[PDB]
């Protein structure tokens, strides 16, 4: 699993440092094992339509 | 000249060092500093 360029969020979500929205608080979180397993479930569901 | 090179690994290393320097892991427990200071917030995307 590859990740996007880190500079995308720095210039867009953290464009203003004196404000805090729903996106900015969770742009700094990290996933656990079960959450990665759920991501794998989502991708498996996508790759078999219907 | 104080030069900072575009190589990502170096910028990450200075970023980590500055984050340690401003907010160290040791007195973040004892002194219970507030994270709302303008400098510590500015540290988030200062050298990205």
């Amino acid at each position: 699993y590859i990740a996007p360029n880190p500079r995308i969020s720095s210039i867009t979500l953290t464009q203003r440092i004196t404000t805090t929205g729903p996106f900015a608080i969770l742009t700094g979180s990290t996933p656990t094992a079960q959450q990665l397993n759920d991501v794998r479930k989502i991708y498996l569901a996508l790759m078999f339509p219907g | 000249k104080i030069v900072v090179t575009d190589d990502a690994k170096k910028r990450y290393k200075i970023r980590l060092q500055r984050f340690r320097t401003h907010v160290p892991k040791i007195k973040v427990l004892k002194k219970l500093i507030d994270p709302n200071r303008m400098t510590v917030r500015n540290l988030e995307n200062q050298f990205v």
């Binding site: 805090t20 900015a24 608080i25 742009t27 700094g28 979180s29 | 980590l16 984050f19 907010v23 973040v28 219970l32 507030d34 994270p35 709302n36 510590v40 917030r41 540290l43 988030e44």
Partner: peptide, 13 residues
Amino acid sequence: LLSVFALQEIMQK
């Protein structure tokens, strides 16, 4: 590896 937004969450304990 840390972000300033997680600092508020871990700090508010």
